[PDB]
Design an enzyme around this catalytic site. Structure first.
Site, PDB file in Angstrom:
ATOM      1  CD  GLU A 152      -2.950   1.300   2.301  1.00  0.00           C
ATOM      2  OE1 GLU A 152      -3.222   0.278   2.962  1.00  0.00           O
ATOM      3  OE2 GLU A 152      -3.473   2.404   2.549  1.00  0.00           O
ATOM      4  CD  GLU A 169      -8.727  -4.423   5.880  1.00  0.00           C
ATOM      5  OE1 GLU A 169      -9.693  -3.725   5.517  1.00  0.00           O
ATOM      6  OE2 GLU A 169      -7.710  -3.950   6.430  1.00  0.00           O
ATOM      7  NE  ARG A 211      -9.852   0.197   9.554  1.00  0.00           N
ATOM      8  CZ  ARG A 211     -11.123   0.246   9.177  1.00  0.00           C
ATOM      9  NH1 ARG A 211     -12.035  -0.516   9.782  1.00  0.00           N
ATOM     10  NH2 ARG A 211     -11.484   1.057   8.191  1.00  0.00           N
TER      11      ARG A 211
HETATM   12  O1  LIG Z   1      -9.291   2.335   7.134  1.00  0.00           O
HETATM   13  C1  LIG Z   1      -8.361   1.820   6.477  1.00  0.00           C
HETATM   14  N1  LIG Z   1      -7.497   2.629   5.792  1.00  0.00           N
HETATM   15  C2  LIG Z   1      -6.470   2.115   5.069  1.00  0.00           C
HETATM   16  O2  LIG Z   1      -5.665   2.841   4.443  1.00  0.00           O
HETATM   17  C3  LIG Z   1      -6.321   0.641   5.030  1.00  0.00           C
HETATM   18  N2  LIG Z   1      -5.444  -0.209   4.450  1.00  0.00           N
HETATM   19  C4  LIG Z   1      -5.875  -1.426   4.828  1.00  0.00           C
HETATM   20  O3  LIG Z   1      -5.171  -2.661   4.403  1.00  0.00           O
HETATM   21  N3  LIG Z   1      -6.969  -1.427   5.624  1.00  0.00           N
HETATM   22  C5  LIG Z   1      -7.240  -0.108   5.754  1.00  0.00           C
HETATM   23  N4  LIG Z   1      -8.242   0.466   6.466  1.00  0.00           N
END
Ligand SMILES: O=c1[nH]c(=O)c2[nH]c(=O)[nH]c2[nH]1
Ligand SMILES: Cc1cc2nc3c(=O)[nH]c(=O)nc-3n(C[C@H](O)[C@H](O)[C@H](O)COP(=O)(O)OP(=O)(O)OC[C@H]3O[C@@H](n4cnc5c(N)ncnc54)[C@H](O)[C@@H]3O)c2cc1C
Ligand SMILES: NC(=O)C1=CN([C@@H]2O[C@H](COP(=O)(O)OP(=O)(O)OC[C@H]3O[C@@H](n4cnc5c(N)ncnc54)[C@H](O)[C@@H]3O)[C@@H](O)[C@H]2O)C=CC1
Ligand code: FES
Ligand code: FES
Ligand SMILES: [Ca+2]
Length: 1304
Positions: free
Chosen positions: A775, A1234, A853
């Site tokens: 990412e 996830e 989170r």
């Molecule tokens: O809220 C999130 N933002 C992200 O940038 C991200 N990247 C991820 O793998 N899960 C999440 N969840």
């Protein structure tokens, strides 16, 4: 001669200038262009490079077939063999049954491991056309998959087994015809009529001699004792690749008949030292089957070790003599050979001696005994005698393909007719810098009877004799000591049983019947799997595939090795290779860089540093990272610069010749180091609701505690990779990248180079996995590479080695939490205060959003009226931690379930009752004030608790635990709530572009990237329904910044939702344009309307876009919705722990998952299983170790143990919730990637229950709240099972005090 001649897929290869350092993998990919065979690790651990070898065996007199790791096989060892790769067995035009079955059964997701798994199954079938289910499972001991959770692979292949709505239809599988397999090359059968002569290959640095006779080998060793023997290369290959050892002269003795003979003598069986372990296995299995039990005790000991010794690919070439002479302290065979006094024959020119393996054989770390000019000829493995008993033991991190923490061979000989000890030998690996015997304890035992006082005398001796320094390599000193005593206890009890079976049961005594399970050899039940999902409406057209189990669109190409990943793309003739140069210090000043040696390596081009950056050296999500280190390094792994060379081999050699001088600065490594130093990223994050003071005062009970949760390496099978192609005009560059984030790749490259974004194009066809690790962290490779391409004007490529990737790119955030929970005697929770700390490493990256989170999920499924949660992100001198599937959720929720498990224990109530009564109801607000609508979790709970038969199994668990002392079962059921949407609101947007060509075919693209999650498949399904045309008319080729701009990363499980809506809207625009033509020709085909539109000059191209409405949470006012909806699910798991070793079996798992109306139940069930198994790794086996100086010890699959085929729940049931449409998302689906991962905590908590049962047996009280940190490894499980053996081992912790590793 000096020509190397072999065959590949039936085609003759003549290599006139073979270099000894060239592996088969490198030759296949780079010389022959056959990129079906993959690099996943380079160290024999993953199986991604598996290929088949055929040869005419001169000794057996037949054609033989076996699998090998191409990454470790020197091509110089391969004279006159036939190699078969994935391309050799079939292709998409004519798939082999193995390829067809893995593709169609949904056993290929990202596809990177598929060719290696195909080749493992293919080789088995060439050797055994009707295998058993057990043989099939055993074929994959050296293969890893990170995506599938293994279940679908074994299920599809079970159809091959002799004894072995729907996701797939096995009735549609074409049959196997063995007559259609490739011919064994006729030339090779002709060549076996001519005798083998000595061959010599000379490379850049290495000379390789393939000896034909013993005389030639011995002469060469007499004249050049320096000559390195290589047989399997499974040690030497690693020494050369990872330990940077250079042996300028190698001799391979594998052709010599005397080193390959098996001879049955009066005292045992003699194996030539070059005999593969696969041959030792087959010979001994034969002998065990035909000879009386009393002669085969040592044979069965060896077999028990070989069972858990690597996999088929390694055992095919790894020699028995090679293991002995390597003399690793953790060898699994040496303690067996020592304990049995196996007879070794050593020879040189003119000399011959016979020795017994005992303590003198190993005079030092990785030393024999042998003189420089001597070779090992043979080893005699002895028959056992009457009154002689043997046991072999191994405990590692994972059962399969792993390094022993402790390994052991044990022998007892009794005086005839007695239970008095004549001989006793207890030998250990992993307890010193060599294989050792307990020579101070065992003499004390001679003439004693086999009884309780002997037991206690040996345990007391072993505990005194087998000391370990606090700093001993490997760590885990308490665990290691406890295992030596525990292994002896098992041997003691086994010997009692063996004496009884010899009709001396009255002399020796009977075993306590609750003790018997302690002596059982490991066995699992056959696997039982269930997949339940909803059928689509009867009236849905057959061409509407939404909600249908359509296989991944690239599955057939993945199975055939035709699917192209970044490094499979052919090199331009002028392409260069890059190698990163990284910091070996956690915090230091760079005082000088010396490239003198680098410049001497042929092919060297340049060394790039911060000085070479045209515009900005500031990069990363929050601009706090360097492209290349300037002045200081801030972690071990900090990128200082990059070498550019003609080849990857020359780049690696040159990077070694870049000499850096450091001046150490004060390092901050641990979460505690960071707390002490006020070293954090930004301020405290906080959510609070209600009144904590009032809550705690009204509470009947209050419980405080801490929990540590270890991090996690992504272990995507394809490591980070970029190719940058400069276009020579206007700063234009094209990057081909394995990344989830094309937008940031483009932006970071452009900013570094100093060009506008419109000059940079980033393209992604597919990734071999990402899981969040690509990412952001992919860009550290992309930028260095883009820079080399700009500077040279030539295309440049870099794929990271596994060790580089694990070091540099970071992982999941380790978490420390300190909680205080207030609750009623009823189990109702009234107050909660939790302080979270994460270890973020040396840049901010995504750390703060991860903590957000975690805090959004600290309630998990539970309503808590008075709650305060805080999070702090530690700034440390460690590689920067990043996104990982779950993104802080799993850590937040594990803490929640941890104190909840203690609430139930403190109340003395059943845990499931406590959880249920605390659960939210429909319409409740969370602690962050979001309303819970369409709250399906109670349905998931009721369905799971009933279908899993949780209550009846609880009875059986309690029964098992009352009837067994040294094995315990545990059973737990765990819920989850997971908020769907990026925590940063504007990231919840997606775009698409659609073209319809005049033949009516459709080219679709969208912002999402394919990493194995079947996103392109789902988008085609959506577009097909939206356009009302078959999926066959729609194609998605790739993801590109120049087709869809400004795309969010493929992350947050949101990509199908976001891109699906974008795709839907682009399709609606097209349909609107075609409507006048549809109205004129109401039945005329799709192709008629399209040609009519074109010839009427109507546009057949459209963009589509979507943004998630109504998002935006404030931490200041605790208001606004962060999420669009929530995912829900429940899992019930059962485990069986071994109290004496810490090993455990995952017996059964049942999952009920709310995925709305699934877009694709095949892909969704595969995501549930894949996520669950990654969580299983997180919570139970995956552990990273760092030195006190912040250097990662754990740099490959050898030490980093992800779940294996044999790790998964034996009974594995997954149901998708029926009748639960989610109107707000694309066609009523829900995101799936996830949410199921945390459900694997059900295994963590089942383990905790089993330990509680074990502790109730030895110790004072009762409802004590013992500590179990995550992951719950064999070390933590065993150490928690306090007993008489752990008590004799506690001694230590001299504050303070060097140790091998520090908890970060
Ligand atoms: O809220 C999130 N933002 C992200 O940038 C991200 N990247 C991820 O793998 N899960 C999440 N969840
Ligand atoms: C994935 C993987 C898993 C593994 N798992 C295990 C395990 O579970 N347990 C375990 O114990 N090991 C394990 N190993 C280690 C290794 O595979 C074994 O030690 C193997 O037997 C080495 O044999 P080889 O023929 O490949 O040795 P090579 O690499 O060719 O040589 C090893 C050493 O032995 C010397 N040598 C070889 N033959 C002779 C001879 N006859 N005379 C004198 N010296 C000789 C060589 O010079 C060299 O120093 C594993 C390795 C890998 C890659
Ligand atoms: N690649 C794989 O998957 C596997 C490989 N093998 C073996 O594992 C080996 C790993 O090699 P290395 O990393 O060099 O490890 P090594 O050969 O140095 O052995 C490390 C282990 O030896 C013991 N040890 C060493 N010195 C000690 C001391 N002074 N005091 C107490 N204990 C000590 C510790 O148990 C430590 O974990 C390989 O050479 C291979 O033979 C075995 C199983 C799996
Ligand atoms: S690449 Fe050869 S085993 Fe992993
Ligand atoms: S499909 Fe096996 S690693 Fe991705
Ligand atoms: Ca970070």
């Amino acid at each position: 001669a000096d020509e190397l001649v072999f065959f590949v897929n039936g085609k003759k290869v003549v290599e006139k200038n073979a270099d000894p350092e060239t592996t088969l993998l490198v030759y296949l990919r780079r010389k022959l262009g056959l990129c079906g065979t993959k690099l996943g690790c380079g160290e024999g651990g993953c199986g991604a490079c598996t290929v088949m070898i055929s040869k005419y065996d001169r000794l057996q007199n037949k054609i033989v077939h076996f699998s090998v790791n191409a990454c470790l096989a020197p091509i110089c060892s391969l004279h006159h063999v036939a190699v078969t790769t994935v391309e050799g067995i079939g292709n998409t035009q004519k798939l082999h049954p193995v390829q067809e079955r893995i593709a169609r059964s949904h056993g290929s997701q990202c596809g990177f491991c598929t060719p290696g798994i195909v080749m493992s199954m293919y080789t088995l079938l060439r050797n055994q056309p009707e295998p058993t289910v057990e043989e099939i499972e055993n074929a994959f001991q050296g293969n890893l998959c990170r995506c599938t959770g293994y279940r679908p692979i074994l299920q599809g292949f079970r159809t091959f087994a002799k004894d072995g709505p729907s996701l797939f239809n096995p009735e549609d599988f074409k049959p196997l015809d063995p007559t259609q397999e490739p011919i064994f090359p006729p030339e090779l059968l002709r060549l076996k009529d001519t005798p083998q002569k000595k061959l010599r290959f000379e490379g850049e640095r290495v000379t390789w001699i393939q000896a034909s006779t013993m005389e030639e080998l011995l002469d060469l060793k007499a004249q050049h004792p320096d000559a390195k023997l290589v047989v399997g290369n499974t040690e030497i290959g690693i020494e050369m690749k990872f330990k940077n050892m250079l042996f300028p002269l190698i001799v391979c003795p594998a052709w010599i008949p005397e080193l390959n003979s098996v001879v049955h003598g009066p005292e045992g069986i003699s194996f030539g030292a070059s005999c593969p372990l696969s041959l030792v296995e087959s010979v001994l299995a034969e002998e065990i089957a035909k000879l009386p039990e009393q002669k085969t005790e040592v044979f069965r000991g060896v077999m028990e070790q070989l069972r858990w010794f690597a996999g088929k690919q390694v055992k095919s070439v790894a020699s028995i003599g090679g293991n002995i002479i390597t003399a690793s302290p953790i060898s699994d065979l040496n303690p067996v050979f020592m304990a049995s006094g196996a007879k070794l024959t050593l020879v040189s020119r003119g000399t011959r001696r016979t020795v017994r393996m005992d303590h003198t054989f190993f005079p030092g770390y990785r030393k024999t005994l042998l003189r420089p000019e001597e070779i090992l000829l043979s080893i005699e493995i002895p028959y056992s005698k009457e009154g002689e008993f043997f046991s072999a033991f191994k405990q590692a991190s994972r059962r399969e393909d792993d390094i022993a923490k402790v390994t052991s061979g044990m022998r007892v000989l009794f005086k005839p007719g007695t239970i008095e000890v004549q001989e006793l030998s207890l030998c250990f690996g992993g307890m010193a810098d060599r294989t050792i015997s307990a020579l101070k304890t065992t003499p004390k035992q001679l003439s004693k009877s086999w009884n309780e006082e002997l037991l206690q005398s040996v345990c007391a001796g072993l505990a005194e004799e087998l000391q370990l320094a606090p700093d001993a390599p490997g760590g885990m000193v308490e665990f290691r000591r406890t295992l030596t005593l525990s292994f002896f206890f098992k041997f003691y009890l086994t010997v009692l049983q063996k004496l009884g079976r010899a009709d001396l049961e009255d002399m020796a005594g009977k075993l306590d019947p609750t003790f018997a399970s302690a002596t059982l050899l490991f066995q699992k039940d056959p696997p039982a799997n269930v997949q339940l999902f909803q059928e689509v409406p009867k009236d849905q057209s057959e061409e509407d595939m939404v909600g249908r189990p359509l296989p991944h669109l690239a599955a057939n190409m993945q199975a055939s090795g035709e699917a192209v990943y970044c490094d499979d793309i052919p090199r331009y003739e002028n392409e260069l290779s890059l190698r990163l140069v990284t910091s070996t210090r956690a915090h230091a000043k760079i005082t000088s860089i010396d490239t003198s040696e680098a410049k001497k390596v042929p092919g060297f081009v340049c060394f790039l540093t911060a000085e070479d950056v045209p515009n900005s050296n500031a990069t990363g999500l929050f601009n706090d990272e360097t492209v290349f280190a300037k002045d200081e390094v801030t972690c071990v792994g900090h990128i200082i610069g990059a070498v550019v060379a003609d080849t990857p081999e020359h780049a690696q050699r040159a990077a070694r010749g870049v000499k850096i001088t450091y001046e150490d600065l004060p390092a901050i490594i641990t979460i505690q180091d960071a707390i002490n130093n006020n070293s954090f990223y930004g301020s405290e994050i906080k959510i609070e609701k209600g009144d904590l003071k009032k809550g705690f005062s009204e509470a009947d009970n209050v419980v405080s505690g801490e929990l540590y949760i270890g991090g996690q390496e992504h272990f995507y099978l394809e490591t980070n990779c970029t190719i940058a192609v400069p276009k020579g005009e206007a700063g234009e560059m094209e990057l081909f990248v394995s990344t989830q984030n094309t937008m940031k790749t483009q932006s970071f490259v452009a900013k570094m180079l100093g060009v506008p974004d419109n000059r940079i194009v980033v393209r992604v066809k597919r990734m071999g996995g990402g899981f969040g690790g690509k990412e952001t962290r992919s860009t550290v490779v992309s930028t260095a590479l883009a820079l080399a391409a700009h500077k040279t004007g030539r295309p440049v490529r870099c794929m990271l080695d596994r060790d580089e990737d694990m070091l540099i790119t970071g992982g999941r955030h380790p978490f420390l939490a300190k909680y205080k929970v207030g609750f009623m005697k009823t189990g109702t929770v009234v107050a909660l205060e939790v302080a979270h700390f994460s270890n973020g490493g040396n840049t901010e990256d995504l750390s703060r959003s991860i903590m957000e989170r975690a805090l959004f999920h600290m309630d998990n499924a539970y309503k808590i009226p008075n709650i305060r949660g805080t999070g702090r992100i530690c700034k440390t001198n460690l590689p920067s931690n990043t996104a990982f599937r779950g993104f802080g959720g799993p850590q937040g929720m594990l803490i929640a379930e941890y104190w909840m498990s203690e609430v139930a224990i403190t109340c003395g109530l059943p845990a499931e009752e406590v959880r249920r009564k605390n659960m939210y109801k429909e319409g409740d607000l969370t602690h962050f004030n979001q309303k819970l609508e369409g709250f399906t979790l109670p349905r998931c709970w009721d369905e799971c608790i009933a279908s899993s038969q949780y209550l009846a199994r609880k009875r059986e668990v309690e029964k098992f635990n009352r009837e067994n002392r040294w094995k315990k079962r545990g059973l737990c059921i765990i819920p989850t709530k997971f908020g769907i949407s990026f925590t940063l609101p504007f990231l919840n947007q997606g775009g698409a572009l659609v073209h319809v060509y005049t033949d009516g075919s459709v080219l679709l693209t969208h912002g999402g990237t394919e990493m194995g999650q079947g996103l392109h498949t789902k988008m085609v399904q959506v577009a097909s329904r939206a356009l009302k045309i078959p999926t066959s008319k729609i194609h998605i080729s790739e993801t590109s910044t120049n087709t869809v701009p400004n795309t969010s990363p493929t992350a947050a499980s949101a990509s199908a939702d976001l891109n699906g809506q974008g795709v839907y809207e682009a399709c609606q625009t097209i349909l609107k344009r075609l409507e006048p033509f549809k109205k004129k020709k109401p039945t005329g085909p799709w192709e008629a309307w399209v040609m009519d539109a074109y010839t009427s000059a109507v546009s057949l191209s459209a963009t589509g876009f979507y943004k998630t409405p109504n998002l935006g949470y404030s931490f200041e006012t605790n208001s606004g919705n962060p999420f669009h909806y929530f995912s829900y699910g429940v899992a019930c798991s059962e485990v069986e722990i071994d109290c004496l070793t810490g090993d455990h079996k995952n017996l059964r798992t049942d999952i009920v998952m709310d995925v709305g109306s699934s877009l694709n139940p095949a892909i969704d069930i595969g995501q549930v299983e894949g996520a669950f198994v990654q969580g299983l790794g997180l919570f139970t086996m995956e552990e990273l170790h760092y030195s006190p100086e912040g250097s990662l010890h754990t740099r490959g699959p050898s030490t980093y143990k992800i779940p294996a085929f044999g790790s998964i729940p034996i009974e594995f049931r997954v149901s998708l919730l029926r009748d639960c449409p989610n109107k707000r998302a694309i066609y009523a689906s829900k995101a799936v990637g996830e949410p199921p991962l945390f459900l694997a905590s059900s295994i963590f908590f089942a383990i905790k229950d089993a330990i509680r049962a074990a502790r109730a047996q030895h110790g004072d009280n009762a409802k004590q709240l013992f500590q179990l940190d995550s992951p719950a490894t064999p070390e933590k499980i065993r150490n928690a099972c306090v007993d008489q053996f752990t008590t004799l081992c506690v001694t230590g912790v001299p504050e303070n005090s060097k140790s091998w590793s520090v908890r970060i």
